[PDB]
Amino acid sequence: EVQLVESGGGLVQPGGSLRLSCAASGFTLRSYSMNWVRQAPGKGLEWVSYISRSSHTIFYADSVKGRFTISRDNAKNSLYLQMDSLRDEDTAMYYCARVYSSGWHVSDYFDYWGQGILVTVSSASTKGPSVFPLAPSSGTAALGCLVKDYFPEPVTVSWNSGALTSGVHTFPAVLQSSGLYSLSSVVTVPSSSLGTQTYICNVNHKPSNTKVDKKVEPKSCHHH
Amino acid sequence: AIQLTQSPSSLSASVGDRVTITCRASQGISSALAWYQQKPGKAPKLLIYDASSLESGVPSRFSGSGSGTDFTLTISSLQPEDFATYYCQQFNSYPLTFGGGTKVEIKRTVAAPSVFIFPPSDEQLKSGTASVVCLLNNFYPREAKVQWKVDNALQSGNSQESVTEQDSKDSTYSLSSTLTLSKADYEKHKVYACEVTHQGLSSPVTKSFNRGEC
Numbered sequence A: 001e002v003q004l005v006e007s008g009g010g011l012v013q014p015g016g017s018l019r020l021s022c023a024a025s026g027f028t029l030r031s032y033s034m035n036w037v038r039q040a041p042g043k044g045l046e047w048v049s050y051i052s053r054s055s056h057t058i059f060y061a062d063s064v065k066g067r068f069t070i071s072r073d074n075a076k077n078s079l080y081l082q083m084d085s086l087r088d089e090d091t092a093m094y095y096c097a098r099v100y101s102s103g104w105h106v107s108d109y110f111d112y113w114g115q116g117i118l119v120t121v122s123s124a125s126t127k128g129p130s131v132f133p134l135a136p137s138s139g140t141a142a143l144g145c146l147v148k149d150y151f152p153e154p155v156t157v158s159w160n161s162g163a164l165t166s167g168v169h170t171f172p173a174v175l176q177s178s179g180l181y182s183l184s185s186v187v188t189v190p191s192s193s194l195g196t197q198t199y200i201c202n203v204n205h206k207p208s209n210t211k212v213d214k215k216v217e218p219k220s221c222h223h224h
Numbered sequence B: 001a002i003q004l005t006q007s008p009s010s011l012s013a014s015v016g017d018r019v020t021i022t023c024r025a026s027q028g029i030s031s032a033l034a035w036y037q038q039k040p041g042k043a044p045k046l047l048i049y050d051a052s053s054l055e056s057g058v059p060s061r062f063s064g065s066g067s068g069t070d071f072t073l074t075i076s077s078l079q080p081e082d083f084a085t086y087y088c089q090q091f092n093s094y095p096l097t098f099g100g101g102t103k104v105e106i107k108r109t110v111a112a113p114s115v116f117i118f119p120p121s122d123e124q125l126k127s128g129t130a131s132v133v134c135l136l137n138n139f140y141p142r143e144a145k146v147q148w149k150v151d152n153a154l155q156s157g158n159s160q161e162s163v164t165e166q167d168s169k170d171s172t173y174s175l176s177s178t179l180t181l182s183k184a185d186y187e188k189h190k191v192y193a194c195e196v197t198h199q200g201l202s203s204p205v206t207k208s209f210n211r212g213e214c
């Protein structure tokens, strides 16, 4: 398995610095020219920077020209991007991308991509999410979890440790007017199986090492 | 730089239809074009290089044609899992540039949403804020209206929507609408209603609750 494993994104304040590194395995990096490609949330693909096998030739897109530095450690089979004076327009998913290598002929289309790491440039701080149940009321009933007030992206929601996938819908996040993200995750289940089967949504939010679970049950009313 | 113009931006197309996306270059690039498929979230997958050569492992309904300035990506029989944004890029010269993309959406028969409504959990109310959540479940088309009525008055500019990706089997969406207000404003009222207008429903559907009623 040829893989490109990238790491080191995160959240920084405007003007800060980050280094993205992409670790190549199952092939020798020195054989290929390497690119960075990025993507703003819900926008197109923008090419970022190029580097020769030899570290001989580097190119930059005008947006990043004097701020980003592409580099290469072939002995570590790794590709780097230093990102100085980061800005709002730099927030995006960053892809480490391998160009096809033929000798004769030209072929700078992408053979293999990394999975992408996220870079967020914001003045807002890493907050972890509060998780609330969307309780099933009263032959299908729906239930879920409200993952509210976190930063930055992403979270991921599973159900019963991943043992429940059928009929699950995890919604894209929205930015609340407060500047924090919020999303819902829901599942429809047979209502005859309501009071017998336990439902636990497993929320994970890496950017703050917050991992919350929650038992979703219908609300009986023994109060005051 | 070389600019690439893709037509169209969005596509509606029934399963089994032939779909054709174009990509016009600002200058002759000969055969140096690639097509990619991007499922949202995941990285782009390479479909076609050198204008028309298929990448290994790509189903044959995908085909490339064109030379010099005008190029075409073609899906001869659109499958339900083909929903994706598709990009062309030129490798004639650096900087490498992409088209703006084409969002491909599957057309299917009208399906009315199942509506649900979820009152704020007690825990959330304990922290002084109230989220009411309405669900529209497994519907088509994406076009739906969700109106919030609190004690029978229509709410404006205090709620947000989110739509799932088209489902890769039945081609249906799901929508969540969240109403948000302070524990104070939430406690001034009794009836919380979610009214949904959608093509597959002959007349609006309202799900609702009165505050804390098992």
Ligand code: NI
Pocket: A056
């Ligand atoms: Ni030289």
Ligand code: NI
Pocket: A223, A224
């Ligand atoms: Ni009481």
